Structure formats: structure tokens, C-alpha cells
Design a binder for this molecule. Sequence first.
Ligand SMILES: *C(=O)c1ccc(-c2c3ccc(=[N+](C)C)cc-3oc3cc(N(C)C)ccc23)c(C(=O)[O-])c1
Ligand SMILES: *C(=O)c1ccc(-c2c3ccc(=[N+](C)C)cc-3oc3cc(N(C)C)ccc23)c(C(=O)[O-])c1
Lengths: 9, 9, 366, 366
Amino acid sequence: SEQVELEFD
Amino acid sequence: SEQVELEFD
Amino acid sequence: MKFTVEREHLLKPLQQVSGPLGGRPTLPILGNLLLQVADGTLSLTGTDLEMEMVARVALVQPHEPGATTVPARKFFDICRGLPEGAEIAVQLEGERMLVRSGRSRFSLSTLPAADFPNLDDWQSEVEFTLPQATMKRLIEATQFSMAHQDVRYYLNGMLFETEGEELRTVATDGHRLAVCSMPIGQSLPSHSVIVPRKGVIELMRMLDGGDNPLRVQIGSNNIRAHVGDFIFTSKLVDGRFPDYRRVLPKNPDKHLEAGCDLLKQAFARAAILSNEKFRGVRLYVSENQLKITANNPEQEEAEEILDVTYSGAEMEIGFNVSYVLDVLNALKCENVRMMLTDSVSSVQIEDAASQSAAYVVMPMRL
Amino acid sequence: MKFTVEREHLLKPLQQVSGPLGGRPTLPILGNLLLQVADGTLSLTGTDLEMEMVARVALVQPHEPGATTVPARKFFDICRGLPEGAEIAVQLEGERMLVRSGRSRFSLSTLPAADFPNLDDWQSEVEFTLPQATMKRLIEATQFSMAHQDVRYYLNGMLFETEGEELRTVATDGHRLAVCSMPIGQSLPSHSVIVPRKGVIELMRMLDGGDNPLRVQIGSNNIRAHVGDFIFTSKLVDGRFPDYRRVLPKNPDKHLEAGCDLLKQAFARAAILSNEKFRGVRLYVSENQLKITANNPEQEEAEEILDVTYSGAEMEIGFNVSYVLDVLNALKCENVRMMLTDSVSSVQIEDAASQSAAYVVMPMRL
Ligand SMILES: *C(=O)c1ccc(-c2c3ccc(=[N+](C)C)cc-3oc3cc(N(C)C)ccc23)c(C(=O)[O-])c1
Ligand SMILES: *C(=O)c1ccc(-c2c3ccc(=[N+](C)C)cc-3oc3cc(N(C)C)ccc23)c(C(=O)[O-])c1
């Protein structure tokens, strides 16, 4: 994805 | 007409 | 084409010439500004095919002749976004124009200067000069009465009329009219032209420092205004503009005078409970008293009573409150005078202390 | 019901309680304010079913008990439209509420006070007090990072968390996060609740008393804030709010520090030539130097070079420039610090002179 998503684990 | 029109003619 | 100009010498010009544009042009080229360097001068031009705004900027730093067109909004934002005092170097390189200031660099897409649409040449038939403050007053006093998208094209603009030593403006939308005249101090031939509304607004907006004089040239199909280092040219609107003298009430038998602020505020409060779409309010005039009422579909009602100076028979007359407020807001004065006849005839409103401007508002039946 | 109060004592209350009103809801009663007169007090309530704003106005002039609901916008406009220092008399008469001031009279349509929707009763589990300025800082520092209409409901709000003697707010939309913590000098039990987005804004808007104390009460499903003579209550959002600690970069091997203004202005100018919808910009970090680049579909490019303090391996990393600018705009400080790891991992940003607030922004693959 062009925008990386926050990884809350 | 509720609003009267200006009469120039 | 190359030039280097201080940010502060480019900002106003860029903002001004971008006036006729819209950010959402119907044609790519109309979204660009034509830049031309020649004989120590940088010329900037913006257009919408109906009118054009040109700015001339003296080039005191080294430069090279040439021309091109670049996106107006982007170029303006770049210059405006640079720090105060920044030196803006520009260099044309074919399909792109480079811009550099400090270590801030940009490349804008261009379109051939030959593709830029310019108005056809014309000849001036009338010419006069006046203080910007005067032209600004003439326009601001009447512009709100211009029609917007009326099938009667000649109403979607403002009449500029010269007579004797006076310049007069007239605007009307069939429901209300505004007229203002001011002495120019020079003998002029009787002439009359209609400036398209978009052009009126653009002109009004180029009038900043009341001091500097304004030079106006009127042709058979164009009008041009020279303001400082700016030159505005617009096509004219065809058609027979109505004669304001014919809507002015004749032999008004009813006269009212009242404080402008009190009147305005009373109409403003009453408007709150007027029909959101039709905005009708009723005026009841009687012995030195004015009663303003308004009601809406929810059966809510407002009533304002004011002490006024009134002479004539008692009467009820309706009005679109927005039209009345427009006049009162345009009249930034102490007292207002109203001249009436019957319940369905024109009402003339003016500053009780000045006849330079006059307003006519047709009532509503109710 | 009857009361008479000075305009200046009614203006702010009316403006504040109208806050939760959409201004065009699909429910007539929700467009009204509940007015209640009892024991020397006029109470005004506005609601949108999820939250309510209550204002209490002492009644020093004669009055009579009772209650009703009237159109919020119209009543406010009428009161604000009256002259400064005006005395506003109100008298309920069935399906209409009359309003009189001087010779300005109004009649508003009412709806039964019994029809007014009130939130259900609840019990407070935790409460503390703090300066309005502190709560205001906590919200303003993070509110821009809340999600808007995410399917993940818990993100469409702000986490309010008490721990030790600190109150912390956290907001995130999955792309960026903001966290702020402030000590309040009161031993507090560990707790966390999510305040609905609209509720966060309404709360932020009732804060204007600077050092004036704010009282907060948190229940299992509601939060309440007592601000002077205003009481704001909102339902809470269910769900597990993410743990900000988990998105903070671990063992950052790259660190950058630069002036906030210069950084902000450089990103601002570069943004001009970034994709209008994706807003991507590229950052290149090298020894004491930052290069920011941007390009759009028209092949236009912007490049900014800045002197910065940078330690770590050279690297290129992409970002949505609006997210970066939001952070820089929220920080009202001299220098900013950035901690990074790799090109596709979290980047932490903060005021180089304060750790009270921290921001995390996820890059974009460019
Ligand atoms: C979003 O636009 C996007 C993000 C990442 C990638 C991508 C990969 C995604 C998922 C993977 N696994 C589940 C194993 C591996 C990926 O490997 C990649 C390798 C490269 N190289 C070597 C240049 C680039 C991108 C990815 C994609 C994608 O479309 O590949 C898209
Ligand atoms: C607009 O809504 C509107 C304006 C006027 C009238 C109206 C008349 C219109 C045209 C007429 N002629 C061409 C002869 C005569 C009219 O007479 C009227 C008489 C009254 N009375 C006696 C209360 C009221 C209105 C008119 C109308 C309309 O619909 O009648 C509408």
C-alpha cells in the first residue's frame, strides 16, 4: 500500500 | 407576483 | 527567458493578474499566466477570454528576453511561500520553467506563449482620469444590485455613464436598482457602456491606494483601466440598459426618515422570523412611527416599533428584507430617507445627507 | 414560565448549549433548547442524543417556574441581534414563547419540555480537577490525529487515560498518532475511556477560562465536565483503543533535529507540487542535511535543501506531507526532533525541548 498502516502488533 | 417587477418600459 | 526579482515586487502583481482566473478553468492555458521579458520589463498577464489583467514589473537585475506561460496558482503559492525578502530567480527551459530562491528549487510545466489567448486590438473613443477612491465609491455603492445570471444579459453588469463632468454607475436586477454619480472635474461627452459583472468586481478589486489616479479608456466594445503598473481590459456587454430615471418614484406623497443603524438592526432582527425563501416583511407607516413585522410558515412572528419622522397617509407595504438590508448596509450613514407612493410602487431610499447615490426597491405583495 | 435577564448574561450560555446541535438535524426537537426555570435559576440544555450541554443562569429578576423548548438558532440570533445592555423578557404561552426587549417583540414555536430527550442517569467512578488550560492543551495537542468516519469506531474519538498523577490523551487514525501527557497533582486510579470525536471538539470549545478549574467525572459509559456554570456530558465509545507505546519506534538508529519554522515552510512549499490527492513527498537524510522533494502527475518538481543536525545512515523515506505539516503546526516550538529506523517504519516527532507530547507518523512507499 502506498500509505503504510500503523502496526499495533 | 409576490415580488413586484421594476417597470422601466 | 530569464529574470531575478525580489519576492515583494512579484507578490501583488501575481495576485492581481490571477484575478480573472478561477483555479478550475475550462481550458488548461486559461489557468496559466503569460510571462514576457523585454526592454527591462517583466509583463504578467491573466485572462478568461472576456477580460485580461496585465502587470508590469521593472527588472533592475540582469535578465534575458523571452516569453512563456506557467500555472498561475502554483507560481503564486511558491513565491508567497518563500521567506520575506527572498530573491526569486526564474529560468525558462523549454517545456518547463525553473524557479530558484536560496536552496528552494521548483520546476513548473509550461505552455507556449503563442498559445496564450489575447483580446483583439481596439481603439479608444473616450478617455478620462480620476482618483481610485472615486471609482471605488461608484462601484461599491451599486455593485450589489447587479443581476447574476439573468437572461437579460445587459443586467449582468454595471452601466458606466459619463455626462457633463460626472461619471455615473447604475446596476439593477429587475427587483431593485442602485445609482451613483460623482463629479470628475473634466468635461466629458455623453457616453454609456455596460461592464460585465465579473469585470466590475475585478476592477473594484484593483483599486487599493485611494491616492494614485486611475486612467480610463472606453472603446466601442472594450473598457480599459490603468491603475499604477496594472492595466485591466474587459469586453463590454451589448444591449440597452434601462433608464434609472424611469423607476424613480414620481411625486412621492409619503416621506420617512430614521436613524440608519436603528432601522438596519430592526430589519435584521425581524428577518430572523421571515420566510427563509421569500424573506418577506411588512412595514406599517403612521404618524411618526414605523412598525416592521415578519412571519414564517411555522407561524412565528417578529414585530419592531421605531420612532421615525413620517408624513403622509398610513399604509402597509411589503418588502424582501434582504433587498432592504443590502441598501442599508451599502449606506454607511447616520440617517436614511425613504420616499414612497403606493403599496406596489417603487420606494426610493437614500442617505438623508447626500443625493450622490439613490436606491430603488420594488415591494412585495403582502 | 417567565423570566427577564440581561442580554450579556444570556449570549454565551445560548451559544455554548447550541454547540451539539447539527444545525440541520433530522429531528425537530433536537434543533430546540430545553429552557427550565426553577429556584432562582434558568437552565438551558442542548443535545444531539449522544451528548448534552447544560448552562445555568442565575435569575436575579422576578421569574416564574416552568419549562419548554424553543428553536435554538432563532432564539440565539434574536438575543444577539438586540442592542448591548438590552433586557430580555420571556413569557411562555402554550405552543408559543414570547420574547420582548424594548419595542422588539417575538413569538417562537415551542415543543413540550416533556418531549426533550435526556441522557439516562449514571454513576461516576472517578473524578479529578484541573486548570482548563491543561485540558485544553491535552486536546489541542492531539485532536487532529483522530479518525473521522473509520469503521473502527474506537478511532473516531480520543482516549482519555489517567495514570499515577497524570492525565493523557491519545488519538490516531491508523496512519498517524498523537499522544500528550500532563501531570495534575492528584493521585489517580488507572483508567481509560474513549470520548466521541464530536464530544472532544465540544469539550475543547467550552474551555476559555484559562486558570479557572475544570471538574471531570468519568462513569462506565459517560464522561462529564463541569466548566464554570456549564456542564457537558457525553456517552463514551466502546472498544479497545490501541496502545501508543507499541507504535513508538524501537531503538531508533537515525535522529534528526532542525528548526521547526524552516522545516515547516520547506514542507509547505514542496507540498505545492505534490500529488493533489496522495500528497507524497520524499525526504533524503545525509550528514547534517535534509533534502525534501515532491513531484506531481504533470512532471513538476520541488526540491528543498535544509541544514539540519543528522546522525545515522543516509536514507530516503516518503511521507504524506499533510500529516507532517499537521504535526509541525501542532508543535508551537523552536526546534523539532525526529527519530527513525527504516524507510517503511514509524517515525516519531516531537518538540526538541519537551517530551510532554509525541507524534508518530507512518511513511508512504515512494
Ligand atoms: C503497497 O502498495 C505495497 C506494499 C508492499 C509491497 C511488497 C510486498 C508485500 C507483501 C509481501 N509479503 C506478504 C511476503 C512482500 C512484499 O515484497 C515487496 C518487495 C519489493 N521489492 C523487492 C522492490 C517491493 C514491494 C513489496 C507491494 C507490492 O505490490 O509488491 C505493495
Ligand atoms: C402576483 O402574485 C399577483 C399580482 C397581482 C394580481 C392581481 C391582478 C393582476 C392583473 C390584473 N389585470 C391585468 C387587470 C388585475 C389584478 O387585480 C388584482 C386584484 C386584487 N384584489 C381586488 C384583492 C388582488 C390581486 C390582483 C394577482 C392575482 O393573482 O390576482 C397576483
